Amino acid sequence: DCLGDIAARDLICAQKFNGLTVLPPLLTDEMIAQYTSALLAGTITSGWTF
Amino acid sequence: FNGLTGTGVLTESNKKFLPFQQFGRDIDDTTDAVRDPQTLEILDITPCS
Numbered sequence: 036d037c038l039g040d041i042a043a044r045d046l047i048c049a050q051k052f053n054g055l056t057v058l059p060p061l062l063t064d065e066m067i068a069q070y071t072s073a074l075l076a077g078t079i080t081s082g083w084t085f
Numbered sequence: 086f087n088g089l090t091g092t093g094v095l096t097e098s099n100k101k102f103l104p105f106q107q108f109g110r111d112i113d114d115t116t117d118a119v120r121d122p123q124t125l126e127i128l129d130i131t132p133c134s
């Protein structure tokens with residue numbers, strides 16, 4: 036029944052009949068992007084001091 | 086359905102079955118669509134939670 040974006044609604048239908056499920060990761064990709072941006076800004080502005 | 090058993094939610098679908106084909110199948114040998122023997126309509130099968 037279509038696929039809205041990647042994980043917009045998805046009907047929570049990662050299930051496939053005979054007991055086989057896929058679990059979502061703890062950290063969404065936005066948090067990882069924020070982590071990388073923080074590390075990169077820190078290394079540009081402060082060097083290795085931070 | 087005509088000797089084909091299972092369990093799940095039946096819903097209306099928009100598949101295009103050939104005139105002689107009876108039931109569809111996924112890429113993992115699982116059924117996903119069935120012809121209704123009395124009235125020729127395509128029913129999709131989705132497992133309940």
Ligand SMILES: *[C@@H]1O[C@H](CO)[C@@H](O[C@@H]2O[C@H](CO)[C@@H](O)[C@H](O)[C@H]2NC(C)=O)[C@H](O)[C@H]1NC(C)=O
Pocket residue numbers: 044045046047
């Ligand atoms: C759980 O199922 C219900 C079904 O009632 C979903 O409700 C849908 O909500 C969206 C957003 O408002 C509507 O556009 C749909 O029309 C609703 N469904 C129906 C059948 O009316 C609900 O979104 C589902 N929850 C999740 C997390 O997928």
Ligand SMILES: *[C@@H]1O[C@H](CO)[C@@H](O[C@@H]2O[C@H](CO)[C@@H](O)[C@H](O)[C@H]2NC(C)=O)[C@H](O)[C@H]1NC(C)=O
Pocket residue numbers: 123124125
């Ligand atoms: C098998 O199912 C019924 C058995 O009577 C028939 O199909 C319906 O028949 C009624 C009246 O007998 C009609 O009003 C409906 O319009 C029919 N439905 C369809 C989908 O044609 C008929 O004998 C057989 N139907 C089919 C499709 O083979």
